[PDB]
Design a protein around this ligand. Structure first.
Ligand SMILES: O=C(O)CNC(=O)C(=O)O
Ligand SMILES: [Mn+2]
Ligand code: NA
Length: 457
């Protein structure tokens, strides 16, 4: 078979070339090219023969698919396609990396390489590929060919394109493309080519595609942008005694503390169940569930998406719970738990510091991998029956590696303490639509909350 005869029609090819050259939009029955937020093009009915495409779908669906998972994505990818001998796949390689490539090279004036770079992806319920720019040395043009059944926005899996802010960081979704059978999309890989595949919501259907890159000369990426560090602050000096009113007495016993520290020093992590006194814990959950709290959304999408409480406007019990975690007394307690020097009265410049926030996590929220030693603290509220399959767990990994070192699962009134070295990173995995199963049990609840603090020696 062959890709659409109608785009190789020379008058159209030259008009497309002009539009590329001038970075100007161009619309036609068989091809649309847009420049906002960045250069992307859509070719419906990319391949003329429906029979070839059905034969292609069949071969692909008869491949073995392996699970792909990390902070950025969750989906299935095929046995690789490059050396694959099945005839429809073989033909497609040639259609893409000889015929279509020469056409693209001509209109783009980019000398694209023959290098074959293509995979087959399957996205099903809860699968998603979050905000990213495709940047990798050599990648110049991204392409995706959809081989999906009848598809609509409600089924998810949209190819979303982001606008960008002053600092070359993604701002928000300004284009959302719906996949459809035999539609090809391609776009330029650049420092601003931010995009995602939105979560697939259909529980029945499977989003099938061929995707990859045409390789070309390495462009010029600008300097790596570093966000303004979140302000840190020393402990709130002690006025009134606050620990014995808030903390489970078990954990305020000295002999239990040395045992905790013994365990903590071996693994540099611990999990303390029923950390707060239930009297307080329930008042805290009560306020979160029935009180007035002002939330704001945190970004940008290529780093994070979750809700954070406006701390100054919190109900007193939540204000006080935050003050607890900022308090001199807790700094000292954590020293006793960990053997870290977070207070001057703890055994043996430096002034210890912390940053903290009250977070709300629900469907769609996440953080991604982006150096310093630090102690992470999390206290979970309102997540009974929360399942790992929902996402929302915190995963710790070794840097420059795919190795998970630890997983923290939301559990009510459990305090997780985890020490990070400079070669250790963390993220909160994308919370997917299975989490809606929560409402079968707690109909008036949506997601869960935590107190998330970081302490520095
Ligand atoms: O499949 C899509 O619609 C978009 N794919 C990608 O951005 C990718 O695989 O890197
Ligand atoms: Mn991509
Ligand atoms: Na570490």
């Amino acid at each position: 078979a062959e890709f659409s005869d109608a785009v190789t029609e020379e008058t159209l090819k030259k008009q497309v070339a002009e539009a590329w050259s001038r970075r100007t939009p161009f619309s036609h029955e068989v091809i649309v090219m847009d420049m906002d937020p960045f250069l992307h093009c859509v070719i419906p009915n990319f391949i003329q023969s429906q029979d070839f495409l059905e034969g292609l779908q069949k071969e692909l669906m008869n491949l073995d698919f392996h699970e792909k998972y990390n902070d950025l994505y969750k989906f299935q990818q095929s046995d690789d396609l490059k050396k694959r001998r099945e005839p429809h796949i073989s033909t497609l390689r040639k259609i893409l990396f000889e015929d279509f490539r020469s056409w693209l090279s001509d209109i783009s004036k980019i000398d694209l390489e023959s290098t074959i770079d293509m995979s087959c992806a399957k996205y099903e319920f809860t699968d998603a590929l979050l905000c990213h720019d495709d940047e990798l040395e050599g990648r110049r043009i991204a392409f995706i060919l959809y081989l999906v059944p009848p598809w609509d926005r409600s089924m998810g899996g949209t190819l979303d394109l982001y606008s960008i802010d002053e600092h070359f960081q993604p701002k928000q979704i300004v284009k959302s493309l719906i996949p459809s059978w035999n539609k090809l999309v391609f776009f330029e890989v650049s420092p601003v080519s931010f995009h995602q595949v939105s979560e697939v919501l259909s529980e029945e259907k499977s989003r099938l595609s061929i995707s990859g890159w045409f390789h070309g000369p390495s462009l010029t990426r600008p300097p790596n942008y570093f966000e303004p560090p979140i302000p840190r602050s020393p402990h709130i000096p002690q006025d009134h005694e606050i620990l014995y009113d808030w903390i489970n007495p078990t954990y305020l016993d000295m002999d239990y503390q040395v045992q905790i520290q013994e365990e903590f020093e071996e693994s540099s992590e611990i999990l303390l169940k029923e950390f707060l006194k239930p009297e307080k814990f329930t008042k805290v959950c009560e306020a979160l569930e029935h009180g007035h709290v002002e939330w704001s959304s945190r970004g940008p999408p290529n780093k994070r998406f979750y809700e954070k409480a406006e701390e100054s406007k919190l109900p007193e019990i939540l204000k006080e719970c935050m003050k607890l975690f900022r308090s001199e007394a807790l700094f000292l307690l954590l020293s006793n738990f960990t053997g870290l020097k977070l207070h001057f009265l703890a055994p043996s410049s430096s002034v210890p510091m912390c940053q903290g926030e009250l977070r709300h996590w629900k469907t769609g929220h996440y953080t991604l991998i982006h150096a310093e030693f630090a102690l992470d603290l999390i206290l979970y509220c309102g997540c009974e029956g929360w399942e790992p399959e929902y996402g929302g767990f915190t995963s710790y990994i070794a840097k420059g590696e795919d190795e998970e070192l630890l997983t923290v699962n939301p559990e009510s009134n459990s305090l997780a303490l985890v020490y990070r070295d400079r070669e250790t990173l963390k993220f909160v995995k994308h919370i997917n639509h299975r989490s809606l199963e929560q409402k079968k049990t707690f109909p008036n609840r949506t997601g869960f909350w935590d107190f998330s603090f970081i302490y520095y020696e």
